[PDB]
Design a binder for this molecule. Structure first.
Ligand SMILES: *[C@@H]1O[C@H](CO)[C@@H](O[C@@H]2O[C@H](CO)[C@@H](O[C@@H]3O[C@H](CO)[C@@H](O)[C@H](O[C@H]4O[C@H](CO)[C@@H](O)[C@H](O)[C@@H]4O)[C@@H]3O)[C@H](O)[C@H]2NC(C)=O)[C@H](O)[C@H]1NC(C)=O
Ligand SMILES: *[C@@H]1O[C@H](CO)[C@@H](O[C@@H]2O[C@H](CO)[C@@H](O[C@@H]3O[C@H](CO)[C@@H](O)[C@H](O[C@H]4O[C@H](CO)[C@@H](O)[C@H](O)[C@@H]4O)[C@@H]3O)[C@H](O)[C@H]2NC(C)=O)[C@H](O)[C@H]1NC(C)=O
Ligand SMILES: OC[C@H]1O[C@H](O[C@H]2O[C@H](CO)[C@@H](O)[C@H](O)[C@H]2O)[C@H](O)[C@@H](O)[C@@H]1O
Ligand SMILES: OC[C@H]1O[C@H](O[C@H]2O[C@H](CO)[C@@H](O)[C@H](O)[C@H]2O)[C@H](O)[C@@H](O)[C@@H]1O
Ligand code: BOG
Ligand code: BOG
Ligand code: BOG
Ligand code: BOG
Ligand code: BOG
Ligand code: BOG
Ligand code: PLM
Ligand code: PLM
Lengths: 7, 325, 325, 7
């Protein structure tokens, strides 16, 4: 999962 | 322009006979008592703003399963490091500023210098690792890779080793810890040439390994990330979501990078300037400026890397509002 | 137990001959120099946290049409009042604490005392008016009423008059302004009996008009409001929205009311105690406690009445994040 | 309008 980076 | 002693360098001339050891008596010739009080004020603010925010970060991670993922391990490590900065450095400097010198003496100087420098380097390298990790998952530089727990743990270990690499050596003769600025806080001696401890070579090593390398890695990793995201969005312009994601990912990177620079460019800036100009004269208040920027990161790094993280932020708000919301 | 002078009361015994006028020399017998520095730290924190938040509130209201409604007029008035507290009181106390007495002398004492007390009363009565206004629109106590601009403006004017009613009279003989606590800040003299200025009657008036009346109105208004909302929800249990609205309106009231009490119950608490026990002895650090609570409202009232207001909060976030979000 | 009280 890629969007969990901070946003 | 300065007065020298066995374990210190006071940036003031003892031509009037007035200078004392920063371990033994107030430095009120270096600076007015009120300026010492204002230092203590700034210390107080950093502890009063820093501790809650950084502690709270750990506290919610206990309270919320969702937060306990590998990719957050490093943000936790950041918060711990920040806490080493507040209890290692800030609380002590608060105590000593109110005395007007470094009461705890040389041995304390090393304790305080080590832990304060440890914290700061850990935080710093955490920022680098996080970007490496982000880079790996987003840019997918290596086939057949999935970032997991055992990787995250390496990332952390790596920070602690790189910080030890910086903080430890002064304790054992390569460079040294001595009071800086107004002599209420102890740091790495990067301003006087101490042939006995080979300051120069250490300052080089520090500059190269612990500033330009981090800077390059951060710029490269986030540079690629922004490139990858921009590219994907360009090919998927039918999706307004993806366009939003792109803009927001770009905004955060600019912030992170600009923030990183604000934190370390002054330290690197003056260190380079003092290295290059060895004949120079440097006030106590001038020497505190690089520090002022680096230390305040204990407040603002959490704000950027945690409070501006939607997930952490939500859990914090519910925990703070007694549950719900 | 105390030393008296023409314009002051130092809470320390001059039996050792050591006491000086709080207008002329440091009070370092009242308290250690570091405790003065910690005062200055606390002042600094209040200005550093207070000014931005309160200023920002005005700044976004210029930036966002939606904020410029009558029902917000009083929250704006609150923020201005808070700012009178920071520049009238806090900045000055910061300056004087670093000297260790009240450098600006008697005339300054009155200036500082008036504006600091003005701010605080304005803020206080703003809280009362807001509840009156809320009560009127929600509980609909009078038929054929619609709250508008010209009402909102009355509400504001009313605050300024009620604050003048409290702050003005000491300037003209009914009570007086004198340094309090560590003698770095000036306030109303509610602790010594000064027959010449009729302190006692003023302290009564203050207690009655400017504490129990506010307290009653707040409790009544929000008491009815919570009752009205609870009742409506009870009759509309099919609507989960209305149930949420009820819970959240209740939570805010508890907070507002508990916050109000934290702010004024200590001031009213000791004033009553000193009034009732006139024979008593009272330290400088003891006298600063009621103040500590009341003053910190400059930070927390905005947080409660503004930052926890969804509308203001949104506009602040967009303005702060350079637009968008 | 009634909910605009703060929430
Ligand atoms: C900044 O400069 C000042 C002055 O240059 C300097 O402070 C001086 O330090 C010396 C110590 O090196 C002090 O010297 C002492 O003077 C007193 C006289 O009052 C002596 O009694 C002391 O002891 C001696 O006498 C004994 C004889 O019976 C001997 O047994 C013993 O070995 C000593 O000779 C000693 O001489 C001097 O008083 C101060 N001066 C001032 C103004 O304080 C200071 O150290 C410099 N700062 C830094 C950081 O380097
Ligand atoms: C707390 O207590 C102390 C002591 O009780 C008190 O300080 C004292 O204040 C008096 C003033 O009322 C000082 O008296 C002065 O003493 C000097 C001697 O050094 C005199 O020269 C002064 O002037 C006089 O002399 C002239 C004769 O040629 C006269 O023309 C003139 O009128 C004066 O008589 C004056 O007498 C006293 O020195 C201090 N003592 C100390 C220890 O400071 C202090 O004011 C009290 N604090 C408070 C807040 O009330
Ligand atoms: O009962 C365990 C709960 O915690 C888990 O989180 C842990 O995951 C790892 C297990 O080896 C640990 O190393 C890590 O430190 C913990 O955060 C799990 O995430 C939860 O779902 C469990 O309820
Ligand atoms: O061009 C006017 C803009 O501001 C208005 O707001 C004002 O409304 C009242 C008009 O008499 C004033 O008393 C009040 O102080 C202002 O806030 C209006 O709200 C905006 O829509 C207009 O664009
Ligand atoms: C955290 C402590 C930093 C001190 C902030 C004040 C900025 C410097 O200010 C200057 O410093 C001089 C001495 O260095 C004083 O003599 C000057 O009066 C003062 O303006
Ligand atoms: C946060 C709490 C801070 C502890 C108070 C600081 C202790 C101040 O201690 C002071 O040190 C002076 C040195 O100049 C000496 O005159 C005295 O020992 C004392 O007044
Ligand atoms: C980076 C280019 C110059 C290297 C010299 C080291 C600069 C001083 O060292 C810095 O001291 C700060 C306070 O002690 C810490 O917060 C930092 O972690 C530490 O690196
Ligand atoms: C804002 C300034 C408040 C001071 C905070 C310290 C709490 C009180 O602390 C006490 O005060 C005594 C003198 O009053 C000292 O002698 C004691 O050592 C100290 O513990
Ligand atoms: C925020 C800026 C604060 C201004 C600095 C405070 C001025 C301190 O001024 C000091 O006052 C002392 C009184 O005890 C005197 O010894 C001297 O005039 C001076 O050292
Ligand atoms: C309220 C019951 C006792 C009345 C005595 C007045 C208490 C002191 O007065 C208070 O002083 C504070 C600082 O100056 C201000 O912030 C308050 O607005 C003011 O009311
Ligand atoms: C659960 O819902 C309880 C939390 C609600 C209370 C929120 C009050 C905000 C307090 C802000 C503190 C500011 C003061 C900092 C200076 C000392
Ligand atoms: C527009 O988007 C620019 C705003 C983004 C930057 C946010 C950075 C947060 C800074 C927090 C400041 C904390 C330091 C306070 C102590 C001096």
């Amino acid at each position: 999962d890629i969007d969990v980076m901070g946003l | 322009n300065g007065t020298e002693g066995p374990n210190f360098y006071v940036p003031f001339s003892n031509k009037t006979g007035v200078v004392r050891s920063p371990f033994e008596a107030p430095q009120y010739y270096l600076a007015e008592p009120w300026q010492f009080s204002m230092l203590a004020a700034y210390m107080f603010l950093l502890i009063m703003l820093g501790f809650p925010i950084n502690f709270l970060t750990l506290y919610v991670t206990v309270q919320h399963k969702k937060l306990r993922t590998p990719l957050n391990y490093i943000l936790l490590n950041l918060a711990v490091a920040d806490l080493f900065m507040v209890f290692g450095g800030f609380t002590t400097t608060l105590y000593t500023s109110l005395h007007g010198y470094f009461v705890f003496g040389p041995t304390g100087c090393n304790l305080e210098g080590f832990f304060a420098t440890l914290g700061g380097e850990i935080a710093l390298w955490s920022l680098v690792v996080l970007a490496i990790e982000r880079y790996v998952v987003v840019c997918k530089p290596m086939s057949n890779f999935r970032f997991g727990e055992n990787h995250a743990i390496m990332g952390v270990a790596f920070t602690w080793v790189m910080a030890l690499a910086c903080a430890a050596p002064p304790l054992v003769g390569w460079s040294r810890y001595i009071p800086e600025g107004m002599q209420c806080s102890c740091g790495i001696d990067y301003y006087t040439p101490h042939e006995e401890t080979n300051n120069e070579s250490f300052v080089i090593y520090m500059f190269v390994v612990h500033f330009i390398i981090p800077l390059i890695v951060i710029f490269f990793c986030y540079g690629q990330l922004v490139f990858t995201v921009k590219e994907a969005a360009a090919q998927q312009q039918e999706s307004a979501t993806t366009q939003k994601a792109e803009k927001e990912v770009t905004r955060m990177v600019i912030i992170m990078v600009i923030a990183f620079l604000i934190c370390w460019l002054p330290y690197a800036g003056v260190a380079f300037y003092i290295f290059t100009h060895q004949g120079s004269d440097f006030g106590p208040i001038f020497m505190t400026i690089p520090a002022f920027f680096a230390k305040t990161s204990a407040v603002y790094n959490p704000v950027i890397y945690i409070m501006m993280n939607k997930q952490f932020r939500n859990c914090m708000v519910t925990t703070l509002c007694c549950g719900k919301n």
